[PDB]
Design a protein around this ligand. Structure first.
Ligand SMILES: */C1=C\C(=O)NCC[C@H](O)C[C@H](NC(=O)[C@@H](NC(=O)/C=C/C=C/CCCCCCC)[C@@H](C)O)C(=O)N[C@H]1C
Ligand SMILES: */C1=C\C(=O)NCC[C@H](O)C[C@H](NC(=O)[C@@H](NC(=O)/C=C/C=C/CCCCCCC)[C@@H](C)O)C(=O)N[C@H]1C
Lengths: 222, 233, 196, 222, 212, 198, 204, 198, 196
């Protein structure tokens, strides 16, 4: 997994790869590692997929109920405190590594939460097995005051650094742009640089090839 | 079966259109204590080959003596020791590769990762890796330790496939390598600001640069970062 | 990590590096290990990031409530709440905390809470992995009631050395000045303290 | 403690035709989640029309190939340049391997060539020497992915004559070199999809009475 | 792996499967678990493949050397002790082999010797070695009579392996038959369990449980 | 382990169970009945850990008898076997699990057919023509795989059994002191007190 | 030791033209010993199918659980549950046991009664969802199934072709796994009918 | 373990030894002779590790036969037992020791008396009226402690044995497939081929 | 143990504490960790007492023989023999050795041989348990070509601090001055260096 966060002049952007694995086998060639906590607070997650998903929803659910109760837009620091306090409560057993971002009544924000519960803050971050490949690109191209387009490029490239160079990462690039004044835009499969080449032959078997022992219809109507 | 004690970190390198470049910082760590600072981990053997070593320093010092002896020895009864029968990078590698695998096979390894960089007599660029297990391989770019994770992704952007080598100049190449050395200084907790760099060009020969330093580091934004989430001041 | 807090004529100053590593990888190079628990009571965090952040966040909550009910808390009190959390949970915590605050009657005060969870009040205190390399230096250079400048220098030197030797430290040196005048944030870059 | 062994991934495949044989392998060399090289040949021409590949722990793989070639050299010196028969090569390799039965070469090796009748031949070994002659065989990281495919497309397993009520098994018509190269490319593009250690390049060696030829195809680099 | 060998009127019957595994992974269904030591001796492979295939080929060499030297075909009792003593020299090193040395010498008649890497060497009439040994014993034990026709004995063998190939996950592939007479042994084909199972089910009515 | 065998013929289920009870170096008993009747037409054989074994069986017994009294009706074998699989599946993830394997054989008076169920301490349940727990299966499954037919009579089945018990005394390491056999059918549960030479 | 490898078995689901297929083997063993050749791993609740590989006891338990749940669901929602919803139910049901999971690998297959769209999905033991558009694999011979599918498979097969393809993938995969086989069953699902066929394969 | 018993009566020594050879789950043989003749009037029974057992016995055999040929004389049992204790006491402190326990029974043609020796893999040697290796001793020593008399005849002794073999089949866990008996006396070594019902 | 060797204008000086402990017990409080291997080549011993004494005794034998045959050995050579023993037997040795000698052509030289068995030539070098506490101090106070007095003071201060913090050091501070003038033994007592 390769996930990144990049702040630009008027917002923040997060990106990720789309490969999921178990050992050396690719489980999902195109899974979504970008999670929506609230309309304008998205979280990118590495670690144990089922955990980032679950923990993301739980806090997402509570932030929605909280939002409704207070009649105020959700804050990213709210997601950050609910998340970290949850992870810390579980002594690190919930394998979630998250980069949470978004905009709210107080500006644009960029954080990262580690499975044990500690949080960081900055203009660019990365987590996952592709962590280092990406950071290498960010430490080489990040500059203060990026434009929305430069940030997406940087973010997108950092993710690519992982796809190619990291065995745990691959497939496509997912991006999500959160600009201070507009609606957040989720760009699923922003980049698809790994389309399989057409197979050399068709393996459509001639009917009757498989030997059957018995047959029957099944009843679905109650 | 030993355990490294005083160690050297990353050794990175790549090859351009006319030769190769290789660099390594001048640190000799002892655990987390950055104990020694005048360590040259770039061993030139002759003037067409540079051997960069990382891992256990005492073993490196030992591989160094082996290299010097390999040179002293090649001269013996060799009227062309400085010509047609001089040491080629490929010989030096194959030798170390041998020594490395024999030592792992005896359960008493030389705790190192090595990259032999140079130019063959026919002009060809030589870049190959070997570590304490005797494992070897080649690629337009090679790095050991941390450099394998951070440096490669960068250098590979310059020379991704073979066809990219002829298109790469020494400036472009030396540049990438120096930038990579900076990135490693940003994230490798066992690195130093000072390093050594070397270029083995089929035309200009061996240019060995010492005492370089990591420059142009971005730190200013560090002031706008307070607290770890909700703190404001 | 390299952290220290020094008292002087006008109050107190806190200093820290900004490196947080996970193994040999520098997870964050611009970290802020200088945390605010009250207006003029801050702390220096060493040990587990998650553990110290969680403890800090709790102490801040307690002091905010302490205030609402009984007014401004003393630095000694903030040290007590830290010490309480640290001692009572010693078996699941890896936190070395330095507590420094500015009082109008007591001027500057420094409390150090080591791994056991015990509390120690001192003129100054160093802590963190890099602190071991500057024990001899600090002991030989610290002086009581130095001026803001003499103190900002004592800290800048001490930490530059700690960062020099300890690979678990580095980045920029951050400071926080606490006096009657208010709260001042300071930052020094490698290019400056490296050549001292 | 010191662990003398390692794993450099890779996967090899060998198929034998009627008058030819092929031995292919990806050209990726890895260590954990890092890629050491996108191109590091794994299949070699040892002479006397014998192609070989020892896959697994590269250091042991090279040591073995090297030792075998050295065996072919002396075979010539000793028996007046007599050609080393593929079956003899097989027996010799078994001794090379078993010679280290108590400190094994961590490799799964396969060799291909032509028998003394001019028919294609493939031989595969145990890390300790057990060997069998076979029609086709995959070895290495993604062997478990390729083998099933091969039993189906190269030996028509579980395939029957349409209509015959699964009573007449499909005939063992034999494959040509063109058809075999297809199953090799498809085998590797498919393996590259689900195995993180397979990719970058596909080097194939074809052995015919006329000698040894090479074909190369790229594979995704993610 | 399932391998059996029993003695009877018509001499000796030897049957084995051909499945080779590495965990739950089936490496091969085409392994030859019968090593042909020579025109009058047979070896069975159970335990480590290489350990058997190698050391048994080695045994063949030793036997041949004995005959050149003694101008007289080696006895089964002795060929079994050479393997036995070799293997015992390595006791503790980890060799893994359970095998049966079978033969017919004018001096001993049909003879079967069990030899494992433990150093155990046993002479007997019926032996089943392998992870599927109990399944073959079941079948074999209850249908054995010294008075079996060379044809009925051959079938009992083939069928005993079928039984084991079914229940045991580590056994399978195909069945290999051998008939041991004094003139030497006679191969009796390779029987793919794939087809042999169905055939036997239909013709015999057994394996009634399985749905066909 | 102990010998726990079960075979379902045409109109009945037969259960064979070793009579030995060994504790370390000494065989303490040669007449042990490793079985419990759950209802007039349902019998359950069991083998496993020293205490768990009986405590579980009796517990299951008590509950099925209670259901009978409360409902004045006898639960079908299938249902009884479902209750048992459930109890074990709970046990498997509890603090201290029951290490008991059981064979359940009964005659469904409503379907008028005999049924055999095999359930292990994990809560694994499967319905079979014949089954066994422990190592017994290892030498008997091939025998039955060979000589079994669904329409066999109780007599034919009792012979097939004797065949199995014979192979077991021949190839098995332990002296299990013979078996106790029981038949379950439309008329209930009865024991074949003459198998020690039948 | 490894729970997911005590009993064995495999399941695979594929999508074709306006149809979905799901198949499984019939083995149930205890290590090397084969115990039953009639242990099916496919179940259905309404028009939704669920394949479950792994520790048999858990395979049974989850089936009884989803029966229970889908039942009450129909009683309250007054309609049959859909594939997409059922997937979510399975996922949360599993993650509910995050720190002591059921050692299973569920596979969901069905056509959405309202949209007519084919749907298949896989889960890891703690509920992680994988919603593919081509195929899902599961079981002790999953690596093999992956190689088989990644090759054989192609989009929009017809019910008659998809049968051949999913049967070939299953069969040849199972034959390279000591813990799978002993029979197999294949379900072909269309918006109107469902055909269940049993396959002929090796029994070793 | 295996059954290795030895009893010395008035004018002979009797050795009983289990005939079973089990390997894990299967009893591979029921007619095994765990004994070796060292000389015309000296027999040695053994039990222990799979390979060591035979390799040691035959090795000891070869050496005693060699002494006989070289000296054209038969070493007394006592002497043969001293040679064996020495061989094991060497083995015990060697690289890979022999794990074999043996009973040595012979007739001293010079003293005209039978002798029984018990020696364990450690090289512990003791002379006894009756002895055994493995667990057998546990149930038979009290029987013999009770019913043994020095002047018993070979017939009386063979009965006392049958008594022991009976207790062993009753209380011992394992099925050892009966025993093979042998008598050693002034006339040599002979086997009682009729004890399977004597 | 706290040991160091510093080069200066007239040659070199070696310093050490005198404490050898076995656990928390001070086995010897007046130990001499300053060993003579040649007339003007000495060493500082840290690590196992038995290991360093044995290695020292061997080097002395080798240099005595070296002399007989080829005359006076260089300081670099004495360092080589030490390094040879230490590297070759790394797996059964726990010795940290500092080699210092006075040459007429090279003046003062210092070689440090750390646990791995590698060799390092430097202007000065510190080693031993207490050495960690004075890394920052020494780096900030050492200067090249100091005078005999400036150097005897640098060492006296540095070691007094090391002894202060490290419980594995203490007793008296011993020194050895190596110059063209000859060999001079120095000793300083607690009462003196403690109040510096
Ligand atoms: C990002 C990749 C990454 O960041 N690192 C690589 C390794 C990563 O952990 C792999 C991860 N794979 C999965 O999440 C898979 N599922 C599981 O790993 C499930 C583990 C279950 C453990 C249960 C046992 C609990 C015992 C509790 C005792 C109290 C696949 C199938 O989703 C991954 O791909 N991560 C990506 C997002
Ligand atoms: C009979 C089966 C049987 O009787 N018992 C099952 C166990 C038996 O030992 C397995 C045997 N299989 C093999 O010999 C296989 N080869 C190996 O297992 C080789 C192992 C080497 C180990 C050293 C570590 C190497 C790591 C390499 C990493 C790249 C097959 C492939 O020959 C078997 O099946 N026996 C049959 C006859």
């Amino acid at each position: 997994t390769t996930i990144v966060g990049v702040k630009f002049n008027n917002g923040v952007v997060i990106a990720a790869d789309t490969r999921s694995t178990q050992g050396p086998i690719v489980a999902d060639k195109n899974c979504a590692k970008l999670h929506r906590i609230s309309p304008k607070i998205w979280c990118a997650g590495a670690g144990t997929a089922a955990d980032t998903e679950a923990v993301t929803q739980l806090i997402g659910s509570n932030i929605e109920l909280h939002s409704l109760y207070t009649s105020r837009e959700p804050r990213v620091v709210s997601a950050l405190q609910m998340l970290k306090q949850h992870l810390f409560k579980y002594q690190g057993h919930i394998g979630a590594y998250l980069i949470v971002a978004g905009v709210d009544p107080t500006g644009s924000h960029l954080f990262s939460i580690h499975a044990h519960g500690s949080t960081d803050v900055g203009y660019y971050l990365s987590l996952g097995s592709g962590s280092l490949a990406a950071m290498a690109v960010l430490e080489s191209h990040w500059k203060q005051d990026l434009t929305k387009e430069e940030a997406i490029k940087l973010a997108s490239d950092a993710i690519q650094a992982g796809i190619w160079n990291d065995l745990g990462s691959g497939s496509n690039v997912d991006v999500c742009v959160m600009e201070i004044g507009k609606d957040a835009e989720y760009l699923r499969n922003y980049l698809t640089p790994n389309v399989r080449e057409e197979k050399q032959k068709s393996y459509k078997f001639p009917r009757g090839t498989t030997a059957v022992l018995k047959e029957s219809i099944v009843n679905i109507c109650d | 079966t030993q355990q490294p004690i005083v160690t050297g970190t990353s050794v990175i390198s790549m090859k351009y259109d006319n030769g190769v470049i290789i660099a390594a910082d001048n640190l000799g760590s002892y655990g987390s204590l950055l104990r020694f600072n005048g360590v040259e981990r770039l061993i030139p053997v002759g003037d067409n080959t540079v051997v960069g070593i990382s891992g256990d320093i005492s073993d490196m010092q030992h591989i160094e003596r082996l290299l010097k002896d390999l040179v002293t020895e090649n001269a013996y009864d060799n009227p062309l020791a400085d010509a047609e029968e001089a040491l080629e990078p490929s010989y030096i590698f194959e030798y170390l590769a041998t020594v490395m695998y024999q030592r792992r096979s005896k359960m008493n390894p030389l705790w190192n990762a090595i990259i032999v960089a140079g130019v063959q007599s026919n002009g060809d660029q030589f870049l190959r890796y070997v570590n304490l297990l005797g494992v070897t391989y080649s690629s337009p770019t090679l790095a050991t330790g941390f450099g394998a994770h951070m440096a490669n992704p960068l250098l590979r952007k310059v020379v991704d496939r073979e066809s990219d080598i002829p298109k790469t100049t020494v400036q472009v190449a030396e540049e990438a390598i120096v930038n990579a050395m900076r990135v490693l200084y940003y994230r490798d907790a066992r690195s130093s600001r000072n390093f050594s760099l070397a270029i083995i060009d089929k035309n200009t020969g061996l240019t060995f640069k010492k005492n370089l330093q990591v420059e142009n580091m971005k730190w200013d934004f560090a002031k706008d970062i307070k607290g770890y989430g909700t703190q404001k001041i | 990590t390299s952290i220290m807090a020094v008292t002087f004529k006008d109050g107190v100053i806190l200093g820290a590096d900004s490196r947080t590593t996970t193994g040999a990888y520098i997870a964050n190079r611009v970290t802020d290990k200088l945390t605010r628990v009250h207006d003029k009571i801050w702390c220096c965090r060493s040990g587990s990031a998650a553990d110290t952040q969680a403890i800090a966040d709790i102490v801040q909550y307690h002091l905010e409530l302490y205030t609402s009910q009984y007014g401004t808390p003393s630095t000694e009190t903030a040290a007590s709440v830290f010490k309480e959390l640290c001692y009572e949970n010693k078996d699941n915590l890896t936190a070395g905390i330095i507590v420094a605050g500015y009082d109008d009657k007591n001027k500057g005060e420094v409390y150090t809470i080591p791994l056991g969870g015990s509390v120690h009040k001192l003129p100054y205190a160093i802590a963190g992995s890099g602190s071991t390399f500057i024990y001899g230096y600090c002991d030989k250079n610290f002086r009581e009631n130095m001026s803001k400048e003499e103190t900002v220098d004592f800290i800048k030197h001490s930490l530059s050395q700690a960062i020099k030797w300890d690979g678990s430290s580095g980045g920029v040196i951050r400071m926080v000045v606490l006096t009657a005048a208010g709260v001042e944030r300071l930052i020094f870059y490698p290019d400056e303290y490296e050549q001292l | 403690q010191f662990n003398p062994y390692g794993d450099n991934g890779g996967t090899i495949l060998g198929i034998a035709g009627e008058d030819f044989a092929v031995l292919a392998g990806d050209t990726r060399n890895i260590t954990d989640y890092s890629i050491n090289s996108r191109y590091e040949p794994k299949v070699f021409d040892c002479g006397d029309n014998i192609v070989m590949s020892a896959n697994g722990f590269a250091a042991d793989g090279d040591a073995l190939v090297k030792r075998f070639k050295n065996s072919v050299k002396w075979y010539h010196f000793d028996h007046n340049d007599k050609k080393l028969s593929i079956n003899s090569a097989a027996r010799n390799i078994q001794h090379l391997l078993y010679g280290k039965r108590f400190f094994p070469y961590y490799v799964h090796t396969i060799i291909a060539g032509l028998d003394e009748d001019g028919k294609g031949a493939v031989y595969s070994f145990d890390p300790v020497g057990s060997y069998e002659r076979e029609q086709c065989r995959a070895g290495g990281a993604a062997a478990s992915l390729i083998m099933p495919f091969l039993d189906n497309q190269v030996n028509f397993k579980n395939q029957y004559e349409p209509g015959t009520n699964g009573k007449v098994k499909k005939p063992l018509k034999y494959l040509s070199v063109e058809e075999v190269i297809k199953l090799v490319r498809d085998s590797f593009t498919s393996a590259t999809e689900r195995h993180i250690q397979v990719g970058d390049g596909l080097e194939i060696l074809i052995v015919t009475k006329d000698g040894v030829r090479k074909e190369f195809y790229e594979l995704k680099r993610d | 792996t399932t391998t059996l060998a029993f003695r009877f009127q018509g001499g000796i019957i030897v049957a084995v499967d051909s499945r080779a595994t590495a965990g739950n992974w089936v490496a091969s269904q085409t392994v030859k678990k019968v090593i042909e030591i020579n025109p009058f001796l047979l070896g069975t492979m159970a335990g480590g493949a290489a350990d058997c295939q190698f050391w048994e080929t080695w045994l063949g060499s030793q036997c041949r050397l004995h005959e050149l030297r003694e101008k007289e075909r080696i006895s089964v009792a002795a060929a079994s002790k050479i393997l036995s003593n070799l293997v015992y020299q390595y006791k503790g090193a980890g060799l893994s082999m359970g095998t049966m040395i079978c033969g017919y010498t004018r001096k001993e008649g049909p003879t079967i010797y069990y030899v494992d890497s433990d150093g155990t060497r046993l002479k007997g009439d019926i032996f089943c070695v392998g992870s599927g040994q109990t399944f073959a014993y079941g079948v074999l034990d209850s249908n054995y009579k010294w008075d079996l026709s060379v044809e009925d004995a051959l079938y009992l063998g083939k069928r005993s392996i079928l039984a084991a190939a079914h229940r045991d996950a580590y056994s399978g592939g195909s069945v290999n038959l051998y008939h041991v007479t004094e003139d030497g042994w006679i191969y009796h084909g390779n029987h793919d369990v794939g087809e042999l199972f169905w055939k036997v089910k239909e013709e015999e009515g057994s394996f009634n449980n399985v749905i066909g | 382990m102990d010998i726990i065998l079960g075979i379902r013929v045409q109109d009945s289920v037969i259960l064979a169970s070793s009579k030995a009870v060994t504790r370390g170096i000494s065989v303490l008993k040669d007449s042990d009945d490793k079985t419990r009747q759950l209802s007039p037409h349902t019998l359950m054989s069991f083998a496993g850990e020293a205490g768990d074994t009986v405590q579980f069986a009796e517990y299951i017994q008590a509950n099925i008898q209670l259901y009978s009294i409360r409902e004045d009706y006898e639960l079908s074998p299938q249902a009884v076997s479902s209750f048992v699989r459930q109890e074990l599946a709970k046990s498997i993830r509890s603090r201290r699990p029951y290490q008991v394997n059981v064979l359940i054989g009964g005659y469904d008076k409503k379907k008028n057919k005999p049924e055999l169920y095999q359930i292990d301490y994990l809560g694994t349940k499967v319905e079979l023509p014949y089954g066994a727990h422990g190592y017994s299966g290892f030498y008997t499954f091939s025998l039955l795989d060979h000589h079994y037919r669904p329409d066999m009579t109780t007599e034919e089945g009792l012979d097939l059994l004797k065949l199995c018990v014979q192979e077991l005394e021949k190839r098995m390491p332990m002296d299990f002191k013979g078996v106790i056999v029981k038949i379950v059918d439309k008329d209930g549960i009865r024991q074949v007190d003459d198998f020690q030479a039948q | 030791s490894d729970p997911s490898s005590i009993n064995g078995g495999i399941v695979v689901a594929m999508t074709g033209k306006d149809c979905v297929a799901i198949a499984c083997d019939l083995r149930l063993g205890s290590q090397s010993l084969g115990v039953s050749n009639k242990f099916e791993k496919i179940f259905h609740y309404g028009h939704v199918f669920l394949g479950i590989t792994g520790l048999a006891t858990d395979v049974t338990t989850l089936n009884e659980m989803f029966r229970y749940k889908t039942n009450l669901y129909k009683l309250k929602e007054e309609r049959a549950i859909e594939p997409e919803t059922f997937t979510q139910l399975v996922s949360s049901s599993l993650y509910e046991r995050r720190f002591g999971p059921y050692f299973v690998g569920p596979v969901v297959a069905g056509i959405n009664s309202k949209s007519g769209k084919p749907f298949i999905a896989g889960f890891d033991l703690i509920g992680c969802i994988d919603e593919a558009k081509d195929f899902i694999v599961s079981g002790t011979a999953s690596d093999q199934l992956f190689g088989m599918c990644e090759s054989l498979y192609e989009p929009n097969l017809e019910p008659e072709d998809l049968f051949e393809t999913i049967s070939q993938a299953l069969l040849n995969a199972a034959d390279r796994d000591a813990l799978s086989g002993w029979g197999a069953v294949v379900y072909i699902i269309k918006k109107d009918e469902v055909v269940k066929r049993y396959l002929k394969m090796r029994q070793d």
